DNA sequence: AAAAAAAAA
């Protein structure tokens with residue numbers, strides 16, 4: 001029966017016109033084909049065509065054929081009747097009131113029409129193709145279950161008339177795609193990644209511009225003549241669409257390490273070691289774990305190893321995962337220069353992928369595009385990982401393995417990339433489970449991985465590589481099977497072949513250790529300090545300790561476990577200084593603009609471009625664990641509250657950071673690089689402040705103390721002594737005298753891994769014949785990090801009236817509306833820059849309408865969710881809101 | 897009581 005064009009697919013935005021369901025259907029199939037040929041990484045084409053066991057060309061047309069059937073579920077009454085249309089020729093199929101999504105209908109119709117063109121009736125390939133297509137709106141569904149010998153009728157397709165028109169369309173796209181035969185195999189994971197492509201296809205050809213243009217040249221009628229024509233047209237128009245979006249590949253020439261970094265005279269031990277023994281190893285899918293100190297060129301080493309594996313795997317894409325928005329920003333710059341130098345583009349964007357990317361001027365847009373420039377299309381919402389190259393927060397990749405809508409899109413996203421995750425030592429137990437499940441899915445999808453780290457506990461390292469190997473190899477780990485990683489070297493690198501699972505430790509090919517920057521050992525000195533009312537009266541020990549610095553000069557940092565304590569020290573220091581030397585305070589609770597300003601002048605004093613510029617003073621910094629995030633600091637003395645060793649040794653890396661540059665003059669009192677470790681005095685298991693034991697688990701603080709004491713003042717040889725300690729704090733059980741504290745720590749840790757497992761998509765082998773796990777969830781949006789999270793507040797000022805102001809000075813009004821009534825992005829940036837990150841608590845509950853944003857604001861993404869904290873000013877008082885009193889000190893940051 | 901991230905077709 002010749003097909004009827006009265007059935008539609010798109011109505012909206014077309015101004016009283018309709019686009020025919022076939023014209024969409026063909027477009028989507030046209031789109032997938034081009035995507036298959038010009039977007040998909042070559043290696044990935046291979047991976048997919050492998051799974052179906054057929055040539056790429058055949059696999060190409062299959063997928064295209066499948067893309068054509070995506071919106072077939074629209075050819076029902078429930079859907080068609082949404083707008084005016086004449087169905088007088090189509091009696092039957094009267095509304096059931098199920099109100100079933102067209103996508104759901106596609107998955108329900110396909111398993112029973114498909115075999116009419118050779119697919120195995122009740123067969124897995126058919127089962128998967130239908131399920132996968134039925135999920136083209138970011139939600140899979142269960143396989144159709146039925147109790148009769150006429151499932152088609154059982155599922156509501158009961159009319160000869162209607163059933164004839166679905167079949168017409170089944171055959172129209174079959175034909176236009178040149179009748180491809182059914183593949184013999186198809187696995188869950190492959191199918192998911194294909195679903196992503198199919199989704200990119202539909203989206204691409206759904207843009208209002210592209211539609212309007214096809215509305216001009218609609219087909220005259222439903223002939224194979226007319227439909228063959230329509231397809232082949234859209235076919236030509238699609239590679240355009242790729243450019244507008246910036247989805248064109250960024251392929252990059254092979255190169256040795258020095259061809260790739262010509263500005264580098266003397267590559268270091270790590271880079272030489274990697275560049276030398278790696279290419280021979282890198283012969284396809286694998287993972288590589290570099291674990292090395294800071295100031296060793298891990299970055300260029302990464303790009304290099306990435307560059308090898310990329311070529312080995314037919315995968316020119318890149319995702320770099322960073323721990324923070326900031327470091328993702330910085331790296332996004334570096335990787336872009338790297339791109340410019342390295343490639344001979346301008347239709348390929350190097351995306352930046354985190355939640356504050358819009359509010360960055362130099363990324364976002366405000367034909368002749370600048371190379372690697374962002375594109376409107378890629379600027380949201382679930383699209384980022386579709387950028388050919390991208391760097392972002394690690395949180396962006398972890399979303400792929402969380403059970404949420406459209407995760408198949410992001411899985412597709414990554415499947416052609418070479419993924420690189422920096423700072424793995426940074427990932428807590430909850431996150432580490434998401435990472436393991438991602439690794440497992442990247443493993444099975446033939447995507448190579450580079451992991452970079454500073455010291456890593458062997459257990460984590462093992463767990464991560466095991467995860468990647470599990471994914472690579474099809475089956476999970478035996479109880480009997482030996483562990484893949486029993487020891488880690490710092491410095492060290494390690495390679496893992498997917499194909500045979502062989503692991504090559506760096507030491508295996510070279511008995512010498514990898515040369516790092518030589519450096520003096522670190523004096524670590526434990527110091528008792530009197531408790532006063534369950535707190536730390538540091539008043540004295542600061543005297544004793546800071547005195548040389550006040551006389552002869554230098555630079556030193558005090559790191560306190562909480563922000564409260566952080567502020568009190570700066571106060572206590574301040575009084576003292578009434579009676580050069582400078583004083584600074586850093587932590588989370590500062591307005592953005594202010595934090596970005598402090599940090600800039602803090603690194604400029606204590607960092608490196610200060611020392612080279614001789615701007616480095618003759619000075620104290622107080623901070624919390626912001627110091628553990630990347631800050632170019634070099635202090636002479638460091639004093640920290642006891643924290644876990646890994647975090648102490650982390651912290652301590654700021655001691656004499658740049659001694660290896662000749663250009664530095666340590667004051668005479670500074671005999672050796674030193675970290676002073678404050679711990680309270682006691683009176684049979686070590687006690688610590690409640691304040692401390694709520695941020696770090698109690699036992700671990702014990703185990704660190706216990707372990708530090710055991711050394712008797714001994715310095716820490718760096719890096720010979722480090723990894724040892726990191727391993728040991730968790731491994732040597734004799735280090736925990738409090739079995740109740742050590743057991744809770746374990747329970748708390750089990751609790752974090754547990755929530756995670758609840759939160760992540762299936763193992764690939766659990767998903768082999770069934771994709772529904774990927775999107776299934778019951779009883780809100782799943783998190784990539786454990787905890788009650790954080791909210792952004794913004795302080796406003798009330799005079800004796802009270803009128804709303806944005807400064808204590810009450811000259812800049814509180815903008816109730818914004819510069820066309822609505823807010824420009826630049827308005828938002830102004831507002832957001834004022835804001836402060838504040839951890840969720842009980843206070844969140846007890847809010848009022850005067851803590852909620854005005855009504856204009858609600859219409860702005862970045863603004864709707866701000867909480868407002870009033871500040872009472874008279875001719876600025878602490879102000880109750882939530883249940884406590886908030887004062888935003890300008891020198892000390894937010895207080896409560 | 898740290899720090900950290902986090903509308904589509």
Ligand SMILES: Nc1ncnc2c1ncn2[C@@H]1O[C@H](COP(=O)(O)OP(=O)(O)O)[C@@H](O)[C@H]1O
Pocket residue numbers: 264265266267268271293294295296297298299300
């Ligand atoms: N031989 C080298 N290998 C790698 N980086 C080098 C080398 N010589 C100089 N550099 C530069 O010195 C800086 C060292 O920083 P890097 O070690 O990558 O990170 P961090 O300094 O944060 O540990 C980088 O800018 C790198 O570009």
Ligand SMILES: [Fe+3]
Pocket residue numbers: 070071102103136137
């Ligand atoms: Fe649809």
Ligand SMILES: [Fe+3]
Pocket residue numbers: 024070071202
């Ligand atoms: Fe569609």
